[PDB]
Design a protein around this ligand. Sequence first.
Ligand SMILES: CNC(=O)NC(=N)NCCC[C@H](NC(=O)C[N-][N+]#N)C(=O)N(Cc1ccccc1)Cc1ccccc1
Length: 497
Amino acid sequence: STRKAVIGYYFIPTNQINNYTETDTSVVPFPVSNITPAKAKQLTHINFSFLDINSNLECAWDPATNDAKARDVVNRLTALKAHNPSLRIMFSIGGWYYSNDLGVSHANYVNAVKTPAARTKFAQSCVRIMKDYGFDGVDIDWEYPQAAEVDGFIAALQEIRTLLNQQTIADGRQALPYQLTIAGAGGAFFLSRYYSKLAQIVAPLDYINLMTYDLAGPWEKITNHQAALFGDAAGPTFYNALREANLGWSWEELTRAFPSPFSLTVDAAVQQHLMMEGVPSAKIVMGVPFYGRAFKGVSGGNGGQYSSHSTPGEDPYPNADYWLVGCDECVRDKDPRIASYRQLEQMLQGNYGYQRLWNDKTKTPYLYHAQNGLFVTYDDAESFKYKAKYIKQQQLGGVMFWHLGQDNRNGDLLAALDRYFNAADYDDSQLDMGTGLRYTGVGPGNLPIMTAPAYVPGTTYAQGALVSYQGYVWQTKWGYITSAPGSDSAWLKVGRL
Ligand SMILES: CNC(=O)NC(=N)NCCC[C@H](NC(=O)C[N-][N+]#N)C(=O)N(Cc1ccccc1)Cc1ccccc1
Protein backbone atom coordinates (compact mmCIF):
# COMPACT_ATOMS: atom_id res chain seq x y z
CA SER A 1 0.00 0.00 0.00
CA THR A 2 1.27 3.47 -0.94
CA ARG A 3 2.05 6.15 1.72
CA LYS A 4 -0.79 8.60 2.70
CA ALA A 5 0.14 12.23 2.16
CA VAL A 6 0.42 14.36 5.34
CA ILE A 7 0.41 18.00 4.26
CA GLY A 8 1.03 20.69 6.88
CA TYR A 9 0.72 24.39 6.20
CA TYR A 10 3.56 26.54 7.51
CA PHE A 11 2.20 30.07 7.66
CA ILE A 12 4.43 32.99 8.55
CA PRO A 13 3.39 36.64 8.11
CA THR A 14 5.69 39.16 6.38
CA ASN A 15 6.51 41.03 9.61
CA GLN A 16 7.70 37.76 11.15
CA ILE A 17 9.86 36.93 8.15
CA ASN A 18 11.30 40.43 8.27
CA ASN A 19 12.16 40.03 11.97
CA TYR A 20 12.82 36.33 11.84
CA THR A 21 14.39 34.78 14.92
CA GLU A 22 14.46 31.32 16.51
CA THR A 23 14.88 32.51 20.10
CA ASP A 24 11.98 34.89 20.73
CA THR A 25 8.45 33.52 20.55
CA SER A 26 6.95 36.96 21.10
CA VAL A 27 8.38 37.93 17.70
CA VAL A 28 8.13 34.55 15.97
CA PRO A 29 5.90 32.17 17.91
CA PHE A 30 6.62 29.15 15.70
CA PRO A 31 10.09 29.27 14.07
CA VAL A 32 11.29 26.61 11.66
CA SER A 33 13.38 25.07 14.47
CA ASN A 34 10.20 23.88 16.18
CA ILE A 35 9.81 21.46 13.28
CA THR A 36 12.07 18.79 14.74
CA PRO A 37 13.53 15.80 12.78
CA ALA A 38 10.72 13.62 14.18
CA LYS A 39 8.06 16.08 12.87
CA ALA A 40 9.91 16.32 9.56
CA LYS A 41 9.62 12.56 9.20
CA GLN A 42 5.92 12.57 9.96
CA LEU A 43 5.14 15.12 7.22
CA THR A 44 5.17 14.45 3.49
CA HIS A 45 4.68 18.06 2.47
CA ILE A 46 4.97 21.41 4.12
CA ASN A 47 3.08 24.15 2.32
CA PHE A 48 4.93 27.39 2.93
CA SER A 49 2.36 30.21 2.83
CA PHE A 50 1.48 32.63 1.46
CA LEU A 51 2.86 34.15 -1.71
CA ASP A 52 0.59 36.25 -3.88
CA ILE A 53 -0.05 37.35 -7.44
CA ASN A 54 1.08 40.99 -8.05
CA SER A 55 -0.35 43.65 -10.41
CA ASN A 56 2.19 42.49 -12.99
CA LEU A 57 0.16 39.23 -12.88
CA GLU A 58 3.09 37.22 -11.60
CA CYS A 59 3.57 35.05 -8.59
CA ALA A 60 5.43 37.22 -6.06
CA TRP A 61 6.37 37.61 -2.42
CA ASP A 62 4.54 40.40 -0.59
CA PRO A 63 6.44 43.51 -1.71
CA ALA A 64 7.23 44.41 1.95
CA THR A 65 9.14 41.15 2.30
CA ASN A 66 12.86 41.26 3.09
CA ASP A 67 14.26 38.97 0.40
CA ALA A 68 17.38 37.78 2.28
CA LYS A 69 15.30 36.89 5.35
CA ALA A 70 12.72 35.11 3.14
CA ARG A 71 15.46 33.02 1.48
CA ASP A 72 16.83 32.25 4.86
CA VAL A 73 13.48 31.02 6.30
CA VAL A 74 12.92 28.86 3.17
CA ASN A 75 16.48 27.48 3.40
CA ARG A 76 15.72 26.35 6.93
CA LEU A 77 12.62 24.47 5.75
CA THR A 78 14.35 22.84 2.81
CA ALA A 79 17.19 21.74 5.16
CA LEU A 80 14.56 19.57 6.86
CA LYS A 81 14.68 17.34 3.84
CA ALA A 82 17.94 15.98 5.29
CA HIS A 83 15.74 13.97 7.75
CA ASN A 84 13.17 12.76 5.22
CA PRO A 85 13.94 12.11 1.54
CA SER A 86 10.19 12.00 0.78
CA LEU A 87 9.54 15.47 2.20
CA ARG A 88 8.53 18.34 -0.05
CA ILE A 89 8.51 22.01 0.77
CA MET A 90 5.75 23.45 -1.43
CA PHE A 91 4.77 27.08 -1.56
CA SER A 92 1.16 28.32 -1.67
CA ILE A 93 -0.12 31.23 -3.65
CA GLY A 94 -3.24 33.01 -2.41
CA GLY A 95 -5.06 32.31 0.86
CA TRP A 96 -8.29 34.06 1.94
CA TYR A 97 -6.75 37.47 2.69
CA TYR A 98 -5.12 37.86 -0.74
CA SER A 99 -7.61 36.04 -2.90
CA ASN A 100 -11.16 36.20 -1.57
CA ASP A 101 -13.75 38.04 -3.71
CA LEU A 102 -13.00 41.26 -1.75
CA GLY A 103 -9.34 40.41 -1.03
CA VAL A 104 -6.57 42.91 -1.62
CA SER A 105 -5.15 41.10 -4.70
CA HIS A 106 -8.31 39.55 -6.08
CA ALA A 107 -8.25 41.24 -9.51
CA ASN A 108 -4.68 39.88 -10.09
CA TYR A 109 -6.01 36.27 -9.74
CA VAL A 110 -8.83 37.02 -12.17
CA ASN A 111 -6.50 38.73 -14.66
CA ALA A 112 -3.59 36.27 -14.40
CA VAL A 113 -5.76 33.42 -15.70
CA LYS A 114 -7.87 35.42 -18.09
CA THR A 115 -5.93 35.19 -21.39
CA PRO A 116 -3.40 32.83 -23.00
CA ALA A 117 -0.62 35.39 -22.66
CA ALA A 118 -1.41 36.15 -19.01
CA ARG A 119 -1.54 32.42 -18.20
CA THR A 120 1.90 31.85 -19.76
CA LYS A 121 3.44 34.76 -17.92
CA PHE A 122 1.82 33.62 -14.64
CA ALA A 123 2.73 29.92 -15.04
CA GLN A 124 6.35 30.83 -15.80
CA SER A 125 6.61 33.04 -12.72
CA CYS A 126 5.37 30.15 -10.53
CA VAL A 127 8.08 27.80 -11.76
CA ARG A 128 10.69 30.59 -11.63
CA ILE A 129 9.75 31.33 -8.01
CA MET A 130 9.82 27.63 -7.21
CA LYS A 131 13.34 27.19 -8.67
CA ASP A 132 14.69 30.48 -7.35
CA TYR A 133 13.85 29.68 -3.71
CA GLY A 134 14.31 25.93 -3.76
CA PHE A 135 10.66 24.86 -3.36
CA ASP A 136 9.42 21.42 -4.45
CA GLY A 137 6.07 22.32 -5.98
CA VAL A 138 3.27 24.82 -6.24
CA ASP A 139 -0.01 24.97 -4.29
CA ILE A 140 -2.76 27.36 -5.41
CA ASP A 141 -5.19 28.56 -2.73
CA TRP A 142 -7.51 30.89 -4.63
CA GLU A 143 -10.74 31.14 -2.68
CA TYR A 144 -12.39 30.93 -5.19
CA PRO A 145 -12.53 31.37 -8.94
CA GLN A 146 -16.01 31.60 -10.33
CA ALA A 147 -18.01 31.84 -13.53
CA ALA A 148 -15.67 32.49 -16.53
CA GLU A 149 -12.70 32.48 -14.29
CA VAL A 150 -13.00 28.71 -13.97
CA ASP A 151 -11.98 27.94 -17.61
CA GLY A 152 -9.01 30.33 -17.28
CA PHE A 153 -8.06 28.74 -13.97
CA ILE A 154 -8.13 25.22 -15.48
CA ALA A 155 -5.96 26.38 -18.42
CA ALA A 156 -3.56 27.99 -15.92
CA LEU A 157 -3.24 24.74 -13.90
CA GLN A 158 -2.66 22.76 -17.15
CA GLU A 159 0.09 25.16 -18.16
CA ILE A 160 1.79 25.13 -14.75
CA ARG A 161 1.62 21.35 -14.84
CA THR A 162 3.49 21.21 -18.19
CA LEU A 163 6.15 23.60 -16.93
CA LEU A 164 6.62 21.61 -13.71
CA ASN A 165 6.96 18.42 -15.77
CA GLN A 166 9.65 20.11 -17.91
CA GLN A 167 11.46 21.14 -14.75
CA THR A 168 11.26 17.62 -13.30
CA ILE A 169 12.95 16.30 -16.47
CA ALA A 170 15.51 19.11 -16.55
CA ASP A 171 16.45 18.37 -12.94
CA GLY A 172 16.26 14.55 -13.13
CA ARG A 173 13.73 14.70 -10.28
CA GLN A 174 11.79 11.57 -11.24
CA ALA A 175 12.33 10.15 -7.72
CA LEU A 176 10.59 13.27 -6.24
CA PRO A 177 8.82 15.03 -9.08
CA TYR A 178 7.72 18.66 -8.74
CA GLN A 179 4.06 18.73 -7.71
CA LEU A 180 0.96 20.89 -8.22
CA THR A 181 -1.93 20.98 -5.73
CA ILE A 182 -4.78 23.32 -4.92
CA ALA A 183 -6.69 24.00 -1.75
CA GLY A 184 -10.30 23.17 -2.71
CA ALA A 185 -13.65 24.26 -1.21
CA GLY A 186 -14.84 21.80 1.45
CA GLY A 187 -18.47 22.94 1.40
CA ALA A 188 -21.14 22.86 -1.33
CA PHE A 189 -21.69 26.61 -1.48
CA PHE A 190 -18.22 27.55 -2.67
CA LEU A 191 -17.63 24.22 -4.37
CA SER A 192 -20.61 24.97 -6.64
CA ARG A 193 -18.52 27.70 -8.32
CA TYR A 194 -16.41 25.14 -10.22
CA TYR A 195 -18.05 21.84 -9.40
CA SER A 196 -19.24 21.06 -12.94
CA LYS A 197 -15.64 21.22 -14.13
CA LEU A 198 -14.16 19.30 -11.22
CA ALA A 199 -12.53 16.56 -13.37
CA GLN A 200 -10.68 19.17 -15.45
CA ILE A 201 -9.50 21.00 -12.34
CA VAL A 202 -8.19 17.84 -10.67
CA ALA A 203 -6.53 16.29 -13.81
CA PRO A 204 -3.34 18.51 -13.65
CA LEU A 205 -3.03 18.07 -9.87
CA ASP A 206 -1.18 15.60 -7.68
CA TYR A 207 -3.80 16.36 -5.00
CA ILE A 208 -6.78 18.55 -4.31
CA ASN A 209 -6.60 19.44 -0.60
CA LEU A 210 -10.18 19.82 0.54
CA MET A 211 -10.77 22.56 3.11
CA THR A 212 -13.14 20.37 5.03
CA TYR A 213 -13.18 22.70 8.05
CA ASP A 214 -14.57 26.15 8.72
CA LEU A 215 -17.94 24.53 8.01
CA ALA A 216 -19.29 26.55 11.00
CA GLY A 217 -18.42 30.06 12.05
CA PRO A 218 -19.84 33.34 13.38
CA TRP A 219 -21.44 34.04 9.97
CA GLU A 220 -23.97 31.26 10.77
CA LYS A 221 -27.02 31.94 12.90
CA ILE A 222 -26.56 28.73 14.88
CA THR A 223 -23.44 27.20 16.50
CA ASN A 224 -22.29 24.02 14.81
CA HIS A 225 -19.26 21.74 14.42
CA GLN A 226 -16.76 23.18 11.96
CA ALA A 227 -15.52 19.75 10.75
CA ALA A 228 -18.08 17.10 11.63
CA LEU A 229 -17.15 13.84 9.90
CA PHE A 230 -20.80 12.68 9.68
CA GLY A 231 -24.07 14.44 10.30
CA ASP A 232 -26.16 14.85 13.43
CA ALA A 233 -29.90 14.88 12.76
CA ALA A 234 -30.28 17.40 15.61
CA GLY A 235 -27.91 19.83 13.82
CA PRO A 236 -28.74 22.40 11.15
CA THR A 237 -29.02 21.33 7.49
CA PHE A 238 -28.28 23.27 4.33
CA TYR A 239 -29.57 23.75 0.83
CA ASN A 240 -27.57 21.54 -1.58
CA ALA A 241 -26.28 24.21 -4.01
CA LEU A 242 -24.69 21.61 -6.27
CA ARG A 243 -28.14 20.60 -7.65
CA GLU A 244 -28.16 24.00 -9.39
CA ALA A 245 -24.74 23.56 -10.96
CA ASN A 246 -24.58 23.60 -14.77
CA LEU A 247 -24.29 19.81 -15.10
CA GLY A 248 -26.93 19.12 -17.77
CA TRP A 249 -28.27 16.19 -15.67
CA SER A 250 -31.90 15.04 -15.54
CA TRP A 251 -34.20 15.65 -12.53
CA GLU A 252 -33.65 12.06 -11.30
CA GLU A 253 -29.88 12.26 -11.76
CA LEU A 254 -29.74 15.57 -9.84
CA THR A 255 -32.00 14.30 -7.08
CA ARG A 256 -30.04 11.05 -6.61
CA ALA A 257 -26.71 12.96 -6.47
CA PHE A 258 -27.75 15.97 -4.41
CA PRO A 259 -30.09 15.32 -1.50
CA SER A 260 -31.33 18.59 -0.09
CA PRO A 261 -31.29 19.77 2.55
CA PHE A 262 -28.17 17.92 3.68
CA SER A 263 -25.67 17.84 6.55
CA LEU A 264 -22.59 19.98 5.86
CA THR A 265 -19.83 17.53 6.85
CA VAL A 266 -16.43 16.21 5.82
CA ASP A 267 -18.05 13.06 4.43
CA ALA A 268 -20.44 15.18 2.26
CA ALA A 269 -17.56 17.13 0.67
CA VAL A 270 -15.56 13.95 0.03
CA GLN A 271 -18.55 12.12 -1.50
CA GLN A 272 -19.46 15.16 -3.59
CA HIS A 273 -16.00 14.95 -5.12
CA LEU A 274 -16.09 11.18 -5.66
CA MET A 275 -19.52 11.40 -7.41
CA MET A 276 -17.87 13.19 -10.29
CA GLU A 277 -16.54 11.08 -13.09
CA GLY A 278 -12.81 11.40 -13.62
CA VAL A 279 -12.07 12.52 -10.00
CA PRO A 280 -9.91 9.80 -8.48
CA SER A 281 -10.12 9.08 -4.77
CA ALA A 282 -6.29 8.96 -4.55
CA LYS A 283 -6.08 12.68 -5.46
CA ILE A 284 -8.52 13.77 -2.72
CA VAL A 285 -6.85 14.95 0.47
CA MET A 286 -8.95 15.57 3.59
CA GLY A 287 -8.17 18.88 5.32
CA VAL A 288 -8.43 19.02 9.11
CA PRO A 289 -8.17 22.06 11.38
CA PHE A 290 -5.46 22.29 14.11
CA TYR A 291 -7.59 25.07 15.68
CA GLY A 292 -11.03 25.50 17.20
CA ARG A 293 -13.71 28.10 16.42
CA ALA A 294 -15.18 29.77 19.52
CA PHE A 295 -18.64 31.26 19.95
CA LYS A 296 -20.06 33.34 22.83
CA GLY A 297 -23.60 34.04 24.02
CA VAL A 298 -24.73 30.43 23.66
CA SER A 299 -27.67 28.77 25.56
CA GLY A 300 -27.67 25.57 27.63
CA GLY A 301 -29.29 22.23 27.04
CA ASN A 302 -27.15 20.51 24.45
CA GLY A 303 -23.60 21.49 25.41
CA GLY A 304 -23.84 24.75 23.46
CA GLN A 305 -24.40 22.88 20.16
CA TYR A 306 -26.90 24.25 17.58
CA SER A 307 -27.59 27.33 19.66
CA SER A 308 -28.05 30.95 18.69
CA HIS A 309 -25.05 33.01 19.76
CA SER A 310 -23.64 36.53 19.84
CA THR A 311 -20.23 36.10 18.28
CA PRO A 312 -19.18 39.06 16.14
CA GLY A 313 -18.58 38.09 12.48
CA GLU A 314 -16.70 41.28 11.53
CA ASP A 315 -13.02 41.36 10.44
CA PRO A 316 -10.89 42.36 12.10
CA TYR A 317 -12.42 41.53 15.48
CA PRO A 318 -14.28 44.70 16.31
CA ASN A 319 -13.42 45.36 19.98
CA ALA A 320 -11.01 44.51 22.78
CA ASP A 321 -13.28 42.17 24.72
CA TYR A 322 -11.25 38.91 24.69
CA TRP A 323 -13.92 36.70 26.21
CA LEU A 324 -12.39 33.31 25.41
CA VAL A 325 -11.48 32.61 29.05
CA GLY A 326 -7.90 31.36 29.41
CA CYS A 327 -6.90 31.96 25.79
CA ASP A 328 -3.64 33.95 25.95
CA GLU A 329 -2.99 33.56 22.22
CA CYS A 330 -6.36 35.26 21.62
CA VAL A 331 -5.16 38.31 23.53
CA ARG A 332 -1.89 38.31 21.57
CA ASP A 333 -3.78 37.99 18.27
CA LYS A 334 -6.67 40.27 19.33
CA ASP A 335 -9.34 37.76 18.38
CA PRO A 336 -11.16 35.42 20.77
CA ARG A 337 -12.84 33.54 17.93
CA ILE A 338 -10.04 31.13 16.93
CA ALA A 339 -7.80 29.16 19.29
CA SER A 340 -4.99 26.80 18.31
CA TYR A 341 -5.25 23.22 19.55
CA ARG A 342 -2.09 24.02 21.56
CA GLN A 343 -4.00 26.79 23.39
CA LEU A 344 -7.18 24.69 23.76
CA GLU A 345 -5.29 21.97 25.61
CA GLN A 346 -4.08 24.59 28.11
CA MET A 347 -7.60 26.04 28.51
CA LEU A 348 -8.93 22.58 29.21
CA GLN A 349 -6.14 21.89 31.71
CA GLY A 350 -6.39 25.20 33.59
CA ASN A 351 -9.19 26.09 35.97
CA TYR A 352 -11.22 28.02 33.49
CA GLY A 353 -14.54 26.18 33.59
CA TYR A 354 -14.61 24.29 30.22
CA GLN A 355 -15.98 20.78 29.80
CA ARG A 356 -14.71 18.68 26.93
CA LEU A 357 -17.68 16.99 25.35
CA TRP A 358 -17.95 14.51 22.47
CA ASN A 359 -20.60 14.14 19.77
CA ASP A 360 -20.70 10.45 18.84
CA LYS A 361 -22.62 11.17 15.61
CA THR A 362 -20.20 13.74 14.23
CA LYS A 363 -17.14 12.05 15.87
CA THR A 364 -15.80 15.42 17.01
CA PRO A 365 -15.08 17.06 20.40
CA TYR A 366 -16.26 20.41 21.58
CA LEU A 367 -15.71 22.65 24.57
CA TYR A 368 -18.64 24.02 26.54
CA HIS A 369 -18.31 26.74 29.20
CA ALA A 370 -21.62 26.51 31.06
CA GLN A 371 -21.12 29.61 33.15
CA ASN A 372 -20.16 32.10 30.40
CA GLY A 373 -22.09 30.46 27.54
CA LEU A 374 -19.13 29.53 25.31
CA PHE A 375 -18.88 26.81 22.69
CA VAL A 376 -15.73 25.71 20.86
CA THR A 377 -15.64 23.32 17.89
CA TYR A 378 -12.23 21.74 17.19
CA ASP A 379 -10.49 18.46 16.39
CA ASP A 380 -8.14 16.29 18.50
CA ALA A 381 -6.18 12.98 18.34
CA GLU A 382 -9.44 11.18 18.96
CA SER A 383 -11.51 12.74 16.17
CA PHE A 384 -8.48 12.02 13.96
CA LYS A 385 -8.89 8.26 14.45
CA TYR A 386 -12.24 8.35 12.67
CA LYS A 387 -11.01 10.68 9.96
CA ALA A 388 -7.91 8.58 9.32
CA LYS A 389 -10.06 5.45 9.19
CA TYR A 390 -12.41 7.19 6.71
CA ILE A 391 -9.35 8.24 4.69
CA LYS A 392 -8.11 4.59 4.52
CA GLN A 393 -11.60 3.16 3.79
CA GLN A 394 -12.43 5.68 1.08
CA GLN A 395 -8.93 5.30 -0.38
CA LEU A 396 -8.25 9.04 -0.22
CA GLY A 397 -4.78 10.37 -0.90
CA GLY A 398 -4.13 11.60 2.64
CA VAL A 399 -4.63 14.44 5.13
CA MET A 400 -3.84 18.19 5.02
CA PHE A 401 -4.02 20.58 8.00
CA TRP A 402 -3.95 24.29 8.83
CA HIS A 403 -1.52 24.86 10.37
CA LEU A 404 1.77 23.52 11.82
CA GLY A 405 2.16 26.31 14.40
CA GLN A 406 -1.14 25.23 16.01
CA ASP A 407 -0.13 21.74 17.09
CA ASN A 408 0.93 21.45 20.72
CA ARG A 409 4.60 21.62 21.63
CA ASN A 410 5.09 17.85 21.50
CA GLY A 411 3.31 17.84 18.12
CA ASP A 412 0.77 15.25 19.22
CA LEU A 413 -1.80 15.98 16.45
CA LEU A 414 0.80 15.40 13.72
CA ALA A 415 2.17 12.32 15.53
CA ALA A 416 -1.35 10.95 15.86
CA LEU A 417 -2.03 11.34 12.13
CA ASP A 418 1.29 9.66 11.28
CA ARG A 419 0.54 6.82 13.71
CA TYR A 420 -2.97 6.15 12.38
CA PHE A 421 -1.61 5.77 8.86
CA ASN A 422 1.81 4.20 9.48
CA ALA A 423 2.27 2.51 12.89
CA ALA A 424 2.51 -1.30 12.57
CA ASP A 425 0.97 -1.71 16.02
CA TYR A 426 -2.01 0.65 15.53
CA ASP A 427 -5.28 -1.12 14.81
CA ASP A 428 -8.59 0.59 13.89
CA SER A 429 -10.34 -2.45 12.34
CA GLN A 430 -12.68 -2.39 15.36
CA LEU A 431 -13.10 1.39 15.55
CA ASP A 432 -16.85 2.01 15.34
CA MET A 433 -17.74 4.74 12.79
CA GLY A 434 -21.10 5.32 14.49
CA THR A 435 -24.55 5.99 13.09
CA GLY A 436 -24.08 9.68 12.14
CA LEU A 437 -25.73 10.66 8.84
CA ARG A 438 -23.82 9.64 5.72
CA TYR A 439 -24.03 11.62 2.51
CA THR A 440 -25.97 9.24 0.26
CA GLY A 441 -25.57 10.94 -3.13
CA VAL A 442 -24.63 8.76 -6.11
CA GLY A 443 -23.31 10.26 -9.32
CA PRO A 444 -21.50 8.81 -12.40
CA GLY A 445 -18.17 8.64 -10.54
CA ASN A 446 -19.23 6.50 -7.60
CA LEU A 447 -21.79 3.97 -8.86
CA PRO A 448 -22.15 1.13 -6.39
CA ILE A 449 -21.58 -2.50 -7.47
CA MET A 450 -25.00 -4.14 -7.95
CA THR A 451 -26.64 -7.23 -9.48
CA ALA A 452 -30.01 -7.64 -11.15
CA PRO A 453 -31.66 -10.04 -13.63
CA ALA A 454 -30.54 -9.41 -17.20
CA TYR A 455 -32.73 -7.14 -19.31
CA VAL A 456 -35.10 -9.18 -21.54
CA PRO A 457 -36.39 -7.60 -24.78
CA GLY A 458 -40.23 -7.77 -24.93
CA THR A 459 -40.71 -7.60 -21.17
CA THR A 460 -42.85 -4.78 -19.77
CA TYR A 461 -41.07 -3.30 -16.80
CA ALA A 462 -42.95 -1.58 -13.97
CA GLN A 463 -41.64 1.59 -12.32
CA GLY A 464 -38.73 0.78 -10.03
CA ALA A 465 -37.77 -2.44 -11.82
CA LEU A 466 -34.01 -3.26 -11.83
CA VAL A 467 -32.19 -4.95 -14.71
CA SER A 468 -28.61 -5.48 -15.80
CA TYR A 469 -27.49 -4.54 -19.24
CA GLN A 470 -24.16 -3.84 -20.90
CA GLY A 471 -22.11 -3.63 -17.72
CA TYR A 472 -24.60 -1.70 -15.61
CA VAL A 473 -27.67 -2.00 -13.47
CA TRP A 474 -30.56 0.18 -14.53
CA GLN A 475 -33.83 1.22 -12.92
CA THR A 476 -37.01 2.28 -14.74
CA LYS A 477 -38.17 5.75 -13.71
CA TRP A 478 -41.80 4.97 -14.61
CA GLY A 479 -43.75 2.04 -16.17
CA TYR A 480 -44.32 0.23 -18.39
CA ILE A 481 -41.05 0.38 -20.17
CA THR A 482 -39.90 -1.99 -22.91
CA SER A 483 -36.98 -0.02 -24.48
CA ALA A 484 -33.39 -1.22 -24.02
CA PRO A 485 -31.81 0.40 -20.91
CA GLY A 486 -29.83 3.50 -21.85
CA SER A 487 -31.55 3.99 -25.19
CA ASP A 488 -34.07 6.60 -24.01
CA SER A 489 -34.87 8.63 -20.91
CA ALA A 490 -36.98 6.00 -19.05
CA TRP A 491 -33.94 4.21 -17.56
CA LEU A 492 -31.74 5.44 -14.73
CA LYS A 493 -28.21 4.01 -14.54
CA VAL A 494 -28.10 3.13 -10.81
CA GLY A 495 -25.18 0.71 -10.45
CA ARG A 496 -22.32 -1.20 -12.05
CA LEU A 497 -21.80 -4.98 -12.41
C1 LIG B 1 -5.08 26.66 3.38
N1 LIG B 1 -6.23 27.59 3.21
C2 LIG B 1 -7.17 27.66 4.17
O1 LIG B 1 -7.18 27.00 5.22
N2 LIG B 1 -8.18 28.52 3.89
C3 LIG B 1 -9.24 28.80 4.67
N3 LIG B 1 -9.44 28.22 5.88
N4 LIG B 1 -10.12 29.67 4.15
C4 LIG B 1 -11.39 30.08 4.77
C5 LIG B 1 -11.09 30.85 6.02
C6 LIG B 1 -11.81 32.19 6.08
C7 LIG B 1 -11.24 32.86 7.33
N5 LIG B 1 -10.50 31.76 8.01
C8 LIG B 1 -9.80 31.84 9.14
O2 LIG B 1 -9.71 32.87 9.81
C9 LIG B 1 -9.10 30.51 9.57
N6 LIG B 1 -8.58 30.65 10.94
N7 LIG B 1 -7.61 30.09 11.22
N8 LIG B 1 -6.71 29.56 11.71
C10 LIG B 1 -12.37 33.43 8.18
O3 LIG B 1 -12.83 32.77 9.11
N9 LIG B 1 -12.81 34.67 7.87
C11 LIG B 1 -12.26 35.44 6.73
C12 LIG B 1 -11.01 36.31 7.06
C13 LIG B 1 -10.07 35.92 8.03
C14 LIG B 1 -8.96 36.73 8.30
C15 LIG B 1 -8.76 37.91 7.60
C16 LIG B 1 -9.68 38.30 6.63
C17 LIG B 1 -10.79 37.50 6.36
C18 LIG B 1 -13.89 35.30 8.69
C19 LIG B 1 -13.56 35.17 10.20
C20 LIG B 1 -14.58 35.21 11.16
C21 LIG B 1 -14.25 35.07 12.52
C22 LIG B 1 -12.92 34.91 12.95
C23 LIG B 1 -11.90 34.88 12.00
C24 LIG B 1 -12.24 35.01 10.64
